[PDB]
Design a binder for this molecule. Structure first.
Ligand SMILES: [Ca+2]
Ligand SMILES: [Ca+2]
Ligand SMILES: [Ca+2]
Ligand code: NA
Length: 223
DNA sequence: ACGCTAGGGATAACAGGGTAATAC
DNA sequence: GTATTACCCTGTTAT
DNA sequence: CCCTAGCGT
């Protein structure tokens, strides 16, 4: 059986590579559960072949987090993270890291959790039936943050930046978070867009749910 | 005065596109 | 040539 | 995502 070591440097259309590919069938449990939070978060899952296969693309400022994720998806990620340096329209140097898994049907299982009537979307009940505490940890490390950033502040309220989802979508997400994890939360408008507000009242419950999965370098997002 | 908020800005993300490296 | 496709790349903001 | 000006008390 081919070893990652043997194809991580071959051409994309290489036979040896495709063999290693066929030796893989499905994502392992962590890869799947964490996958939910990442897709809800900063990751990007795409298909270039009408749903035959999907790969996940990653891009983060924090290198530590990037390396944590690549390691989590180890067997699906051939190359180390690539450094991306660009200039804004303000002539400013912004640094980020990029990486991605190769495409594979193993990813269809994750992708599908977000397609209904044939469109990318957030299903009512995604939370209820699939979002595990691990899922929540990654969603938090990705789009989570504090409500009050003022220094010395004592507000424990939390926020999930869901500004790219529809209000109805976030509305469904909130229902699932309340019902499934008894989190005192609700939708709030920001720049005419939806974010999830998690009352400080439930901070400790929220915290105890994701605590096991967050890494040292993400601990700063917590109040 | 001080704690919230919502308003706001410069990213730190998300989305797609293009091609050098294999196959036949 | 034509078909593949992982690893960059740039377009653009919602975060 | 974070910051912070300035409303509300
Ligand atoms: Ca997001
Ligand atoms: Ca993030
Ligand atoms: Ca975005
Ligand atoms: Na994000």
């Amino acid at each position: 059986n081919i070893k990652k070591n043997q194809v991580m440097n071959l051409g994309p259309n290489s036979k040896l590579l495709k063999e290693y590919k066929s030796q893989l069938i499905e994502l392992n449990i962590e890869q799947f559960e964490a996958g939910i939070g990442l897709i809800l978060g900063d990751a990007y899952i795409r298909s270039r072949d009408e749903g035959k296969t999907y790969c996940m693309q990653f891009e983060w400022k924090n290198k530590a987090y990037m390396d944590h994720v690549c390691l989590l998806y180890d067997q699906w990620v051939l190359s180390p993270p690539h450094k991306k340096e660009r200039v804004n329209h303000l002539g400013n140097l912004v640094i980020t890291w990029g990486a991605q898994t190769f495409k594979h049907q193993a990813f269809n299982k994750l992708a599908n959790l977000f397609i209904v009537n044939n469109k990318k979307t957030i299903p009512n009940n995604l939370v209820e039936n699939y979002l595990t505490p691990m899922s929540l940890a990654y969603w938090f490390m990705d789009d989570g943050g504090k409500w009050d950033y003022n220094k010395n502040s004592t507000n424990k309220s939390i926020v999930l930046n869901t500004q790219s989802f529809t209000f109805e979508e976030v509305e469904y997400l909130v229902k699932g978070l309340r019902n499934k994890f008894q989190l005192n939360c609700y939708v709030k408008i920001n720049k005419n867009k939806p974010i999830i507000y998690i009352d400080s009242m439930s901070y400790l419950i929220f915290y105890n749910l994701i605590k096991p999965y967050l890494i040292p370098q993400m601990m700063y997002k917590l109040p």
